């Protein structure tokens, strides 16, 4: 239904080890489609999804020339950051940039994004109105005033409201097969005894796209968020994801526990229990 495109920039300064590294990655929803790395022998934007390959060499060149300029900008943005914080050339610092667009089922833009970070901390972000800035610290306020003076917000709003929606709409139709089709998780419950009086019940979800999923454990239908161990959703490497939730159960209470899986692929939220007969 709702879709998003975001670009992630990472500019890391390495002293004495040459030019700071610039890595740019592009995501449509939970799928990566493009990448760039300055450390590559022949830096070029490269395709990381099959549907993006349809594009013209001209498109690739455009992406490639944009990334080269952006790396040069953030290399000098890294040295400007040194001045703002009065930091030495000897240290290693990172600039991270995230910008992107949220669209609804229609594909009209819902939200516009642009957050900048310095050394893993919030630095400056474009506000929801797409006309104003939020600064984390006094150093970002210096950058904020420059961006107000140079009318930077006007260009980002133009890109977010137009070029981003038009390319995101295009990617969603070119990869309509992969991007807009939802793989449901395949689910089962496994039993692992800890001891003779205690055991672990594990609820499994595998091979589901998109990554968003809800795994919950209920005992007699009462929720157990306190006592559930929930792991981060992780990739399987085939562009699908896995997740599991575990609870530690006294022997003989296993049937009281139930697992509920919610996903976009599922018609109805499933309810599961341990089936040792099979």
């Amino acid at each position: 239904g709702s879709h998003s495109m975001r670009y992630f920039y990472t500019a890391m300064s390495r002293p004495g080890r040459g030019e700071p590294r610039f890595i740019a990655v592009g995501y449509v929803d939970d799928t990566q489609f493009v990448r760039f790395d300055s450390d590559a022998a022949s830096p070029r934007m490269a395709p990381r999804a099959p549907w993006i390959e349809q594009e013209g060499p001209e498109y690739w060149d455009g992406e490639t020339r944009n990334m080269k300029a952006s790396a040069q900008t953030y290399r000098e943005n890294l040295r400007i950051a040194l001045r703002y914080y009065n930091q030495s050339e000897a240290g290693s610092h990172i600039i991270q940039v995230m910008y992107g667009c949220d669209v609804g089922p229609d594909g009209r833009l819902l939200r516009g994004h642009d957050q900048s970070a310095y050394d893993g901390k919030d630095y400056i972000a474009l506000n929801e109105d797409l006309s104003s800035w939020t600064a984390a610290d006094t150093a970002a306020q210096i950058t904020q005033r420059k961006w107000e003076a140079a009318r930077v917000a006007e260009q980002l709003r133009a890109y977010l409201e137009g070029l981003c929606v038009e390319w995101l709409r295009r990617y969603l139709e070119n990869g309509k097969e992969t991007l807009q089709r939802a793989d449901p998780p395949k689910t089962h419950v496994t039993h692992h005894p800890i001891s003779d009086h205690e055991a672990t019940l594990r609820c499994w979800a595998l091979g589901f796209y998109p990554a968003e999923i809800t795994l919950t454990w209920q005992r007699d239908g009462e929720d157990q968020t306190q006592d559930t161990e929930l792991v981060e959703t992780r990739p399987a490497g085939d562009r699908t994801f896995q997740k599991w939730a575990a609870v530690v159960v006294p022997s003989g209470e296993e049937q009281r526990y139930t697992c509920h899986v919610q996903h976009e692929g599922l018609p109805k939220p499933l309810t599961l229990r341990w089936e040792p007969h099979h």
Partner: peptide
């Protein structure tokens, strides 16, 4: 371009 064309210095 799909990426943001504008270059802005901090």
């Amino acid at each position: 371009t799909s990426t943001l064309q504008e270059q802005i210095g901090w």
